[PDB]
Nucleic acid binder design. Structure first.
Lengths: 333, 305, 333
RNA sequence: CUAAGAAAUUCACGGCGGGCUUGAUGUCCGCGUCUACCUGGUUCACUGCCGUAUAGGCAG
């Protein structure tokens, strides 16, 4: 039983692009006709304040470079001057059937994989993963920098069966902690909804709406696009911002990054906090790669040792492996 | 190539994050092969369980916005990529490139089976839509329902039976819901005509493709050549070079049970239209036929004219 | 312990775009329905007042060059003819947590940095920096040229907790000096508010409104936008002005420049006055760069000598370094 | 069973100083609009009367 040379898992928990529209607090229940936050341009005259070396450095170029202003054109997005509330709306499907790959060479390896995943689900449900997913929808992880420094953040979650609303939840994101996964009755209800969705026992479509008090005319933070920077033509403009038809927006994979911050099971340090689930579990901003393959906690090592050789790891590492199967990806050689 | 009895219509399918590359030489709106292969995937998920048969697909393409960029005043365009996770080691990776679109399209279909006698129209259309709502249409996700679920009810129309006044009546009832969109067909007989016009010098066809969709400025002894339509180059099939292989021969296949060849695409001419030019809407669906004695594949809409 | 190759500090003291609206003095307490100052066009015919080399300046060339057209179209912003008071309104958040970077490679360098900053805060508070910030909100630095030549300038500052007003301050900008930081009871109260904000002990949102008597129908000075005369047809404008939806305005980074004029600790001359806090502390208008890296008073030199080597500088230079951390920026290689 | 399957771009900024756009002027001449009509929509499936429970002398 060698590994399959081709493996591919389609993702579950598929979000959409979040839209931002600004308005006034306590006009909050009628947040349906609020105008969108537009992305505009402004010019910026700054000084050169980076680090400058000492090798091949004529001091005429140095002092000529420091003592001269820099000109540049950026994009900003601000609230209107008579509005102090950011509204961020997106939707979320929960597909289910999180064991079946979409492409596999071997037939014995695929049947062994389905017996392993079905053994996991029959031993214990999806209650842990849906509890942590419910905590990431409870607070406002998907408000990345917009959450930082806010008076009150309110999250409203709706469940949709038809052109209707089945059950509505209304949370408070600042009371719910950022690092402490504490239980609650409503989070157990919504965790039963998501856990009922991932098991394939129904169709789950959720509508998530987030509200934040920032201030009158302050700055919101959409996601930033690529200027490829291939050699020549750096261009006058800088910091272009992502958008939809005349509205600022956030990419879908960034919200999808914010939902799957589960992993509190690093070998190195459990004191920092949960950072998101990746094979070779890494953080791009910190420049570090936790969960090294020189250890025995990598996803590929645990999956090989748990499918091929029946060496079941600890329970929390099994939550890690099934979390990587809900993530999906391109596996195999 | 078999004419369908019904024409199932999916009203407003909005793709998020599509694939706007589609070929090594054309760029924009994706291939017809994604839109036919989606229909065969519905045939593998629904049509064997409701005893129907889905063969073709009708592209309508209401909306299209590609994530592009044009800095530095140049008259060419670049892309808008995304990030990837870090290196295997932990520094950074290389950058592959991938196209992108926020598409919205309506799809005609074609039904052959006996499920109409066993099931009413709203049941068939409801099952097909509520399976297509959990799939991925052209390499990107399908946006679920919102406040714009108001056009989301389907339609279904038997084509053979009934009087001709009900045929043209309900046909115009269909084409008032495909009303802002622009249909898409294949027009290779025009390419044979332009080969016979430019057959004074050289009958090559790829340079004809390079000399159809472009602004020909012909000076006076300057006159822009009049375009006879909104023509566009599309990929139109595969023309396999390698002889066929047995299943357990090539390492790193998808599965070890179906044969293999190495293919390349095959470039053809297509045309965007208004839906009111079409005589009968059953002459619009994209089929694909084959003859695997040789390497000759194509998508087509036979009998459009 | 080498330096981190990636460092980035998000800014604190985040202002917004200031809006200008004109009205009448002694109708000053009802300054809520005042109409905005609009930006309009007018035509201007130029002259010849530039230097000449007198290498291609013949006496016929001057008369030929003043036959020539210097025709031009500019933007102006004036008060209405029956109003003599400029109103400038903006808001200000004070975030706090001014030691934690947003991106850092090393984990030991980041912990050493947090021990250094926490050592600074535990040795002495934020009272000095919030005192100087309180003096820059006290007078009208953020009225750049609008302050010059005015009868009376009045600044009103509000603190906001809810849809309410917690405590209001009313100052007099001309009595408070431009160069002399003298203490006061109200400035100690507002300095306790800002110092309580930067330490992370609460949420601070301030509303700043400024009033200036200029004259009937005089000229106000919004901030100027970037245009580039390239090769197109029939000419274009030569002076655009920044605006919002039908109102003249000032950029946010220019008010942010006016708030952080702290630095009275130049090696060269303390007789000129405080000019704003920059690494390689420079003035773009004067074309000079104080605080050279050939000395040992640069921000990078003091930060390297105070984090890596425990060589603590003088106290006022520590105020400079922490002022650069409240500024934020892109540091590292 | 879709050129199938997967993905965080991030951090910071002062555009600013000065100006004379001028001078002069003919919009002119002429003209056939005309024949015919039922608003009664319900300008509210109605507007004020013994019982706040459907029973009525109503101006109808």
């Amino acid at each position: 039983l060698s590994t399959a040379s081709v493996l591919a898992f389609e993702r579950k928990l598929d979000p959409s692009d979040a839209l931002m529209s600004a308005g006034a607090w306590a006009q909050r229940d009628a947040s349906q006709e609020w105008p969108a936050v537009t992305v505009r341009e402004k010019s910026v005259r700054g000084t050169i304040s980076n680090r400058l070396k000492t090798k091949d450095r004529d001091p005429a170029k140095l002092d000529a470079s420091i003592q001269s202003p820099n000109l540049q054109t950026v994009d900003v997005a601000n609230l209107p001057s008579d509005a102090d509330t950011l509204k961020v709306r997106f939707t979320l499907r929960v597909l289910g059937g999180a064991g079946t790959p979409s492409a596999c060479n071997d037939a014995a390896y695929r049947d062994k994989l389905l017996q392993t995943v079905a053994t996991y689900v029959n031993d214990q449900g999806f209650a842990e993963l849906a509890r942590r997913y419910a905590h990431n929808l409870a607070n406002a992880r998907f408000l990345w920098r917009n959450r930082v420094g806010a008076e009150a953040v309110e999250v409203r979650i709706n469940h949709i069966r038809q052109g209707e609303v089945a059950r509505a939840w209304r949370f408070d994101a600042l009371a719910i902690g950022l690092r402490d996964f504490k239980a609650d009755a409503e989070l157990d209800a919504l965790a039963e909804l998501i856990a009922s969705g991932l098991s394939g026992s129904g169709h789950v479509l959720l509508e998530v709406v987030a509200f934040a008090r920032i201030g009158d005319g302050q700055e919101v933070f959409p996601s930033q696009e690529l200027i490829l920077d291939k050699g020549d033509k750096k261009g006058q403009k800088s910091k272009t911002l992502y958008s939809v038809r005349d509205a600022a927006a956030i990419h879908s994979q960034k919200i999808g990054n914010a939902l799957r911050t589960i992993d509190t099971w690093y070998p190195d340090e459990d004191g920092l906090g949960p950072i998101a689930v990746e094979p070779y579990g890494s953080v791009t901003s910190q420049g570090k790669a936790y969960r090294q393959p020189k250890q025995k906690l990598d996803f590929y090592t645990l999956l090989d040792n748990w499918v091929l050789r029946d060496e079941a790891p600890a329970v929390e590492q099994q939550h890690y492996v099934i979390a990587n199967l809900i993530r999906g990806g391109v596996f195999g050689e | 190539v078999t004419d369908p009895e019904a024409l199932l219509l999916l009203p407003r399918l909005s793709i998020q994050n599509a694939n706007a590359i589609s070929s090594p030489l054309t760029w924009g709106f994706p291939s017809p092969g994604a839109f036919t292969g989606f229909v065969h995937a519905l045939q593998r998920r629904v049509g064997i369980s409701l005893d129907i048969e889905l063969d073709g697909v009708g592209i309508v393409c209401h909306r299209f916005e590609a994530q592009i960029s044009q800095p530095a005043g140049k008259r060419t365009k670049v892309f808008n990529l995304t990030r990837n996770p870090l290196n295997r080691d932990g520094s950074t990776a290389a950058i592959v490139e991938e196209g992108r679109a926020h598409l919205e399209v309506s799809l005609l279909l074609g039904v052959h089976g006996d499920g109409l006698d066993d099931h009413p129209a709203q049941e068939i259309a409801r099952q097909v839509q509520e399976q297509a709502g959990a799939m991925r249409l052209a390499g990107g996700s399908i946006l679920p329902w919102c406040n714009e679920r108001f056009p989301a009810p389907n339609a279904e129309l038997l084509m053979l039976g009934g009087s001709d006044e009900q045929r043209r009546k309900n046909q115009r009832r269909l084409t008032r819901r495909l009303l802002p969109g622009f249909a898409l067909v294949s027009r290779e007989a025009l390419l044979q005509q332009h080969l016979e016009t430019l057959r004074t010098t050289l009958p090559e066809a790829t340079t004809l493709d390079a000399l159809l969709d472009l602004c020909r400025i012909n000076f006076e002894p300057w006159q822009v050549r009049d375009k006879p339509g909104w023509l566009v180059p599309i990929p139109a099939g595969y023309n396999a070079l390698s002889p066929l292989y047995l299943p357990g021969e090539v390492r790193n296949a998808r599965d070890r049970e179906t044969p293999l060849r190495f293919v390349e695409n095959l470039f053809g001419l297509g045309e965007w239209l208004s839906p009111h030019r079409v005589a009968a809407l059953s002459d619009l669906l994209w089929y694909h036929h084959a003859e695997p004695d040789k390497g000759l594949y194509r998508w087509s809409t036979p009998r459009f004219v």
